[PDB]
Design a binder for this molecule. Sequence first.
Ligand SMILES: CNc1nc2ccc(NC(=N)N)cc2[nH]1
Ligand SMILES: CNc1nc2ccc(NC(=N)N)cc2[nH]1
Ligand SMILES: [Cl-]
Ligand SMILES: [Cl-]
Ligand SMILES: [Zn+2]
Ligand SMILES: [Zn+2]
Lengths: 371, 371
Amino acid sequence: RPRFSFSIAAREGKARTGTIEMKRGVIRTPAFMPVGTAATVKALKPETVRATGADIILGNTYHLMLRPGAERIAKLGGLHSFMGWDRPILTDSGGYQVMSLSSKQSEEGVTFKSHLDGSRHMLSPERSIEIQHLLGSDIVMAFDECTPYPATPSRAASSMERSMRWAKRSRDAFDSRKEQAENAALFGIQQGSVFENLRQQSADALAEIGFDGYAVGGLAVGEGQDEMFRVLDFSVPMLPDDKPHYLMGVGKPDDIVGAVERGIDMFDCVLPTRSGRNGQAFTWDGPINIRNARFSEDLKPLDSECHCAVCQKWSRAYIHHLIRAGEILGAMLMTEHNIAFYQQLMQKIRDSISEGRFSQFAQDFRARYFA
Amino acid sequence: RPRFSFSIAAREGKARTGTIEMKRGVIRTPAFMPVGTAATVKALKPETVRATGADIILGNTYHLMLRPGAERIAKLGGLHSFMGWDRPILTDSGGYQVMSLSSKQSEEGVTFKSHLDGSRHMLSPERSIEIQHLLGSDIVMAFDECTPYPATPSRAASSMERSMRWAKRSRDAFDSRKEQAENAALFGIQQGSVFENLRQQSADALAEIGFDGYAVGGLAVGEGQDEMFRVLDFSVPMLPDDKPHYLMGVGKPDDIVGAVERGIDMFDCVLPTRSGRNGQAFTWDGPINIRNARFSEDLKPLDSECHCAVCQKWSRAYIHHLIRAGEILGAMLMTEHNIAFYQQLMQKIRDSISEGRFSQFAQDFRARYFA
Ligand SMILES: CNc1nc2ccc(NC(=N)N)cc2[nH]1
Ligand SMILES: CNc1nc2ccc(NC(=N)N)cc2[nH]1
Ligand SMILES: [Cl-]
Ligand SMILES: [Cl-]
Ligand SMILES: [Zn+2]
Ligand SMILES: [Zn+2]
């Protein structure tokens, strides 16, 4: 079993489908990664996450370093053993949460106060890589400096250029740790906001360093789908074609389809889990809010085609009751269905690309989903 | 498959072990019934409830008549289909929640305002039985009038005597509904508080009417274990020996053991589910609070002997993290373990009675549990 081997089995336009082979398992691409920020995909046992079709989940350096702690997780045997997920885990590097959740930045790194208890903590390229080593991540993200949306040209350039210097420091720290370099992979993060020249400068710097995969940062932060697709149109071709392309934080089903049409291979977002707990269920006819009174006596499953265990066993009417009553089983069932729906979407994307009918799939998907 | 057949396979002192055969399955006794007040055992799929060893669960007339509604559940196919539990369900009649949760009593019945939205509702012996018919309950409880603890002799007698008249009305309403009389069972509820003469009067009235089983009401309401055991000492022998004896709302593991020693066959309580969500895990060495800092790096399972799936797969340290983080999976894992622990306790009770070593089991259990 290889450390990291990406193979493209089929193409259609800019879209690709294939596999990433890693020591802990195969990742089918395009892939959707359920988010497991606090060492759990919310409301699901790991076996249920696997049963939905997920090949890999996402963890977070920032959250786990605060609770329960990186050294503690390593002492307990690593993140895989701790949470009971034995397949690949990608960990974000913490740069986004430093901006979004915490409350001093320099070239060396960043010091910050935890949002949970105000205790002071430090992150740097070297410390982020070390934390991801302690967690035992399979895909390690380079540590970057993020800037809020909407970013001015000056702030976008400044954070991107520092991110590129930090990408080289992340590369060197990873390569210095033998066990990490032999068993994990390292992805760089392209920045530059909506500005084509900065995206190009960022892509050039990352390719010169060399990574196992390339993420597109700085999207899914409020820009809207038209603008995101515009940025992807020019940004993805700048990345090495022969390595995976990971769009961080995306997204809604239609966002995923359009991003695949633009060359993206990997995705993560909290939408299926978080909005599931809030009562939103994804269906091939668009999302529904199960709390709506129209579902109070609806005996049909959440989605009429979905193969998930929830749709085999429980009605909309029951799940409507559970969510309106605040019952934990409502969160469990909505989340399992939504994650299974996302995996079925990815499976349909992969099959349609492999069969050379992805264009028609995307058209049919949109016509029905937005009808 | 019979409507209702109780068979005692073995005895030791006042303790009994055996089976209740019903159309939807066999109930091994002494039995513990997980509580599923809102058409769910909190945080567990029904298949997980079954995997812990539960033969029967408890639902509630008062809660289900308010949300989602009894006629609605019947229109949707009954409670079993609605929640996905195909085995026996016992439903309490609502008399306790009218007292404990709602906010006018007469000989006919009771009118009350819902605790959820203040809407007005009515309950009576006839309406309670009808609601339990609409739900499709397998074991129907007679509708009683409860009085708060501690009850004066006057209030205990008054509520008991009305309860006995309402027990006859419950019997007649059940017998008038052919489908119910042919497929379900009906239990009476002995009242009389801590007063031996009232317990005797109540037992005499219930036996004259005749029921499939006899519950002991009015305990687990604050009286303490010594007093409860004292009341059981004289109350249980008053009930027909050849029918099941159901102690409502009990209880802690040691309460269950002592009640079995006094002739009780069936139990229900929210303790394993509710306290599980709050961080209390049951072990053979007594309860632990998993949130305590001493468990932060403990790799052992919740209990060293427990056969449940949680103890096969996750450490105390992980569950400690989950509960302290407010994660739903923490509630799921704690609840599964606690319900499995309760079922393993019942299995050890049943086996020890069948083998004529229940006295020694109870002594060994207490010496270790309270060490
Ligand atoms: C919620 N949206 C969302 N977009 C993202 C882009 C990037 C990152 N992380 C990173 N640059 N280390 C996280 C994101 N989260
Ligand atoms: C929580 N304790 C607790 N003791 C109980 C006794 C009786 C009942 N119900 C009834 N008489 N219809 C419920 C109980 N709940
Ligand atoms: Cl989430
Ligand atoms: Cl509960
Ligand atoms: Zn489904
Ligand atoms: Zn266990």
